[PDB]
Design an enzyme around this catalytic site. Structure first.
Site, short mmCIF file in Angstrom:
data_model
loop_
_atom_site.label_atom_id
_atom_site.label_comp_id
_atom_site.label_asym_id
_atom_site.label_seq_id
_atom_site.Cartn_x
_atom_site.Cartn_y
_atom_site.Cartn_z
N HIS A 108 103.23 48.13 1.21
CA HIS A 108 103.51 46.73 0.86
C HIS A 108 103.26 45.81 2.07
CE1 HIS A 108 107.34 47.86 2.76
NE2 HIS A 108 107.56 46.55 2.90
N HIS B 281 104.77 41.61 3.41
CA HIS B 281 105.56 40.39 3.17
C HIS B 281 104.71 39.16 3.39
CE1 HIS B 281 108.90 43.08 2.76
NE2 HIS B 281 108.48 43.67 3.87
N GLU C 7 115.80 45.62 6.32
CA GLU C 7 114.61 44.78 6.44
C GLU C 7 115.17 43.36 6.52
OE1 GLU C 7 112.74 45.47 2.57
OE2 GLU C 7 111.64 47.23 3.42
MN LIG Z 1 108.67 45.70 4.61
#
Ligand SMILES: [Mn+2]
Ligand SMILES: [Mn+2]
Ligand SMILES: [Mn+2]
Ligand SMILES: [Mn+2]
Ligand SMILES: [Mn+2]
Ligand SMILES: [Mn+2]
Ligand SMILES: [Mn+2]
Ligand SMILES: [Mn+2]
Ligand SMILES: [Mn+2]
Ligand SMILES: [Mn+2]
Lengths: 377, 377, 377, 377, 377
Positions: free
Chosen positions: B268, B270, B328
């Site tokens: 992934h 962000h 996170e």
């Molecule tokens: Mn992350």
């Protein structure tokens, strides 16, 4: 056993998941001296906490300002070459200083007047390559492992200019024109950089020496540090190489320090510039005195980089049962230190007594001679 | 055994003195994946490599931009309080977010309208204190150990303003005038800051609640994160707290991730900002993809801080036999991620096939639903 | 008499040539409180120590980051206009806030939708001009003297764009083309800027109001601050104008504070941003508490600029026999303060007692209501 | 003919070797208006003076802060795709805005909630991709050529994250684990990035639309700019797209301006932010008024980038016999301008007369309505 | 004809309006070598793309860091003077180096010991004025056109201090007092700077020489570069002036290079500092090798400024049918280069062979002598 961050009636046991192996390595950080106070930047980083670039023929890992941000002016690489392996012909903006920890290697350098220097370097020897001058390293029959120091903390192991990378990114018609050859004659040039590559062991040094029309280099680019007479004091030895003895080493001054078990590199500071440290072997602690009642203690062992900002007070104590061996590195044309003991020894005794609230029994122990490494009674 | 930086025909054995315990902790750094390339900044730092400030009643240690320079926007403190011990009434420029790892504590905060909030926080609960609002922490009967995150990487545990330090550096005649008392009535004020101090356990929370003429605070400053329903996927769980649910948490968005053995936080990125990580328990590796064929793999375990610069591709793999648990953290008003799997699942299959040089057998496995944590087959 | 830097057994008489008038103005700097410690940046500058730009029709002098470097975000001009005199139609990058200390003036502003606003401003009134919107000032029959605040400390009284300067540096053929006139019709345009110029007094405000096809501006650009109900406490008054009441004032929040003789602006801080101060009248001292046992006391009087960096603890004491009147200015969309008294009043008494080493006799004096200005008993 | 830097009795003929083609393109730079004065930064750069990155399927060239250093906040790429050619699935930190100058293309975007948007864009259409959201471009049967603008001047066409580059620098065992497939099933993944690649023309848009469980995106990522009603004035047309109409375009406000031969974009400034310009077709000059009697005139033609720093006065004159067509771009949530004409029109006439030393014959020509583009009489 | 950005199966025709004249000038930018890769800053700027300041007596235009931001350390002015015209007596912070391209001029300089130097400079001659020393230039009967280089990239042609500007901004009573004259005697002083002004041709140089009590300057401030013996190689000539021969030129090292048609300045780098280039005549291309597989090719012709950052690999190829003539400028006390050919020539042949994957047929062509300019076979 399981160390805890407790000092008398201060601190407490660790209640969360933790790194007990690191805590054991850092006894003076988990439980600092009561005399530590205030915020001090981090002055410690391990090569073991870095990515290792592996190649056919060796490896390289680096500690830079991206790892240890206090060290803006100096950066380092730990490089390892297998027998015969070659660190590819290259150059860079930074001057480069080196200490041969293990094995031996042949180095080449050609200067801006087309004068060449080729020499073999063994354990305890140095080299220094001025900024921009192109060079190579080839490990001999034992292989080689060495510490490189570069005079910019922002050093990036690939802002480095490689011969084969340059040619790979130059038009073939230009390379051909440059040398007076055809494109066909250079068709076998590599398509990408080699960087580190395996190769047969070279022949004898005497057979490689290249003669030319431009003469001998004025100053050698290698230095036999451990062949010099060290400053010997009760607890250890100091060997210094700076521009006064290793004449080409204009931007890097260095000292190899050996501290016996039960000894310490005495309380001192450097009046010229920041100290960058590499711990070759053994186990140490150092307190860095930062002014205005700021002080912080760090632990070090083999593989660690340390730092002491310009003029901060410090000592380096052997906290192990083997010799402590480390390098003191400076971006300067000379090595200089001020010894606490020698400073006070050279002042009127009653003046020192007025400062320390101590008497003649103390000022009587002071020594006008500098002993860089002292031994515990 | 003795690990070596060897991967097939690349690398070599270490010939110099070394840190074997650290090498064992960093298997993917000593021997990185062959797919790692290029220079990437350091993205890993251990609390165990920091100075621990010990006080009567606990301790505190910090990881800031002076330790981990990639993290310019976020800094952290690991703080421990003994039963009854008080982190002194104080304020600072930075907003503060917290996760209670062990034990419990009572917090106070008074806002700029003179409204007070007092609450108890247990394991898996959060707090968030807006910039400049004054607060305190007092550990209950188990003591407390918690992770604090501040929204400036330059945070310095003593730019912090302490009640008793302020009064100690204010003229006595002014303090007296301020409160309408005599100098004699305030003669017993402390001469220096307390910071962390021992104290008797408090009474019940209900007995401490302070009423006032200014009303109730509009939004609570604590959050029960582990009481929320997590996103559950095959290999683990994700609990998110940002300004959309923890309404006061305007500058910090957070997720607690649990990854089962044999699972991984999926590929992934962000799209909003940098990720700051804290490893509560277990053992991980993560590869950070930095663009332009730059990637670097890091190992983490309990006590480590990590980082992923804005939009860099990554995953977090459990490489141990216990659950991996980490936070996170983001300096933003919301949590957001883009899943590699979900992205490709939502595109025309032949278009994905044209990119990957793979067929229908691959595009058939893609999922339009986001599974943050996946389990190995 | 001749003040000396002596406090008990500390300090000594001044033996070199000195500035006795300045020493008399700065009694708390020549002889600071014993509680001051550490390095704090300068937080004081006088308009009297600035160059005065004199024009036909008035003058202007400025205090910027080039004079007071702590103030990076806010800068100020003291401007004076004679009766009828015009500050030339102009615009700039910075938003502008103003306080009318003396006299009165007519202001114009036209917005980006071509809507015009023209109004008269008297003593104790404000204006605010959003960044980039063009405006003018014309003094009425008394003349005018006012304080301007700009939301960049780097403000330079000639990065300012003047109508006549723009036209003077535009080709005549372009100006002609722009308006549909001949070059001859604009031959009498000024060759250089006017900046401040004498002019006849204008007519009544009602006769100047310009109607247009684009409607009324949604929010007025002037505010009658001293016509509002102030917060009244025992020792003085506070009048606040921020974006919550003076709706257009988005980047500047302000308070006019009046402190009676024997009174003080109480111990407080601002949880939002830096405070910039202007001393309209009277004589003050303020101690700025900077954390970590750093504090420094400054004296102020009419004509002085002060500053309090973000969240630093402070008070402002009237040290004279006339009212002290000053402005508190903030680059924010709101005014906010935390009162020391109110903070402690809203906590459990035994918790406050545990911090201060004081008893119920002290906590009994605390007030849950905020009194910004307190009076000495 | 051979232009010379002579204006009346000023200047002289060029005596050294010179660039006569460039001199012909820059008549107002070789011979500036007499009204230009002072140092102004360069505000002009041609795409023709940039390196063109050629790929199988098209090309891309960029103007960034490394070419035009005044433009720190905005950067641009001119990209060309052949029919069917694909700009590879990718993402980056910067938001991206685009104007389709030639041809047509299909774009994809998937958001952080897994919602997909696929649409066709033709000549005069826009797109905008929020920071971090992944996307692609595929040219339709005519191919496509378009201008991209990124909201950071430091944009680097390879800090860009490519799908295939990410996978190429991720361990195969992790990719396999991520998708639940074997290493063998992904063995045909590309070893390096594609970036731009040839491909068959896609099918109809309706056949590509991907349905999913997460719903429709709330706002479209494309805009039909030239289908909107423009502001029409005597000399041309202005079409505006900002966050008020193109709802997703939060960080980029834009205007396409067409200026007839003998017309000019009127004297104006922007009260909000810097203007970045792209010259699509035709020939212009613009004088930038920088305050304090600083002004500098620049020439532009097709392929040129221009710039106007925040609030500087300017006009854009058509100096050719074809229409002038250019874009005005701003890093903001709205478009705003202040017209010189409209500003003066909305003030009392005698007040304007007092400034300009002109009479009623001038103030009578002023217009309360804004005409962005005016025509020469 | 109409060039297109096509190289084999890469690129495509330009479909948007474009700058065909610029494209023709930049053939290696529109269609770069296939060996160019990566992002490199712009290294090219034309004087023809700058504003020309026209005065009675000449003109001046500049290329600074505001035009070419890679060049932070060096800036340039192209100045032209008519016969007799005077560049007004002035000084500045920067040292100034000059090359006389056309005509001739008389220069004056007076040093900090009051020693004067007056000399005539013709085509191919240099001057150098140390920082802060005041000087003037007056064109002789042919007029003069010359290239000035200043040792700060931030140079601003009006941070320059003019004699008449200084006097115009000094109180008349102070000027009078300074010289022992009345205000009336200096009433005819100019009200503003002259900068460049027309004047009668001077007399013979011998008649202008000013004697004084302070002696002769130790080193001359002019140098006859083209009267020196150049390094002559097969394809051209190199004339070097640095502090070793032009003794006063401490901060600027220079080389004038002439490259015959079919020749090239060989593959080399500079181990000392950045190269700044000026193209006097002819047409060139240069590839700049930036490390890590980054390389970018630029085209140059008369009027262009180029740049090569510190130690980057490069060559300069004549791509025209006339001689190519350019300057290589360095902010250093010496000129130094490393030749690729000479470097490899001075190493063991089998070692070079191991790097290049080429045999003896290649290493046999290498030359131990440096030939800066080589000719195509
Ligand atoms: Mn992350
Ligand atoms: Mn090297
Ligand atoms: Mn030392
Ligand atoms: Mn706190
Ligand atoms: Mn104004
Ligand atoms: Mn205040
Ligand atoms: Mn994109
Ligand atoms: Mn505009
Ligand atoms: Mn000069
Ligand atoms: Mn060169």
């Amino acid at each position: 056993d399981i160390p805890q961050p407790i000092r008398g009636d201060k601190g407490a046991t660790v209640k969360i998941p933790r790194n007990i192996e690191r805590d054991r390595q850092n006894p003076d950080m988990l439980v600092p001296p009561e005399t530590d106070h205030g915020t001090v930047s981090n002055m410690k980083f391990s090569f073991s906490d870095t990515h290792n670039r592996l190649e056919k023929g060796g490896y390289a890992r680096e500690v830079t300002v991206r790892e240890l941000p206090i060290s803006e002016n100096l950066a380092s690489v730990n490089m390892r070459l297998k027998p015969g392996a070659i660190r590819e012909l290259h150059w860079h903006k930074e001057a480069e200083w080196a200490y041969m920890i293990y094995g031996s290697a042949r180095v080449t350098i050609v200067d801006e007047k087309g004068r060449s220097f080729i020499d073999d370097v063994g354990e305890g020897d140095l080299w220094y390559f001025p900024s921009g001058l192109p060079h190579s390293i080839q490990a001999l029959e034992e292989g080689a492992e060495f510490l490189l120091v570069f005079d910019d903390g922002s050093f990036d192991s690939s802002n480095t200019f490689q011969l084969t990378d340059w040619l790979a990114h130059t038009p073939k018609e230009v390379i051909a024109a440059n040398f007076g050859v055809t494109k066909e004659e250079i068709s076998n040039l590599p398509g990408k950089e080699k960087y580190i590559f395996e190769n047969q062991l070279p022949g004898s040094l005497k057979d490689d020496i290249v003669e030319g029309p431009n003469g001998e280099v004025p100053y050698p680019f290698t230095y036999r540090l451990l062949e010099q007479e060290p400053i010997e004091s009760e607890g250890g030895k100091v060997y210094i190489a700076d521009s006064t003895n290793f004449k080409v080493s204009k931007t890097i001054a260095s000292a190899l320090v050996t501290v016996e078990p039960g000894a310490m590199r005495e309380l001192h500071w450097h009046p010229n510039t920041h100290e960058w440290q590499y711990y070759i072997s053994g186990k140490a602690r150092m307190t860095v005195f930062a002014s205005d009642g700021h002080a912080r203690t760090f632990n070090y062992q083999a593989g660690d980089v340390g730092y002491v900002p310009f003029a901060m007070g410090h000592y380096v104590e052997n906290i192990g049962d083997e010799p402590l061996v480390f390098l003191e590195i400076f971006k300067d044309d000379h090595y200089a230190d001020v010894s606490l003991n020698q400073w006070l020894a050279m002042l009127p005794e009653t003046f020192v007594q007025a400062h320390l609230d101590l008497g003649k029994d103390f000022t009587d122990v002071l020594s006008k001679e500098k002993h860089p490494v002292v031994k515990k009674k």
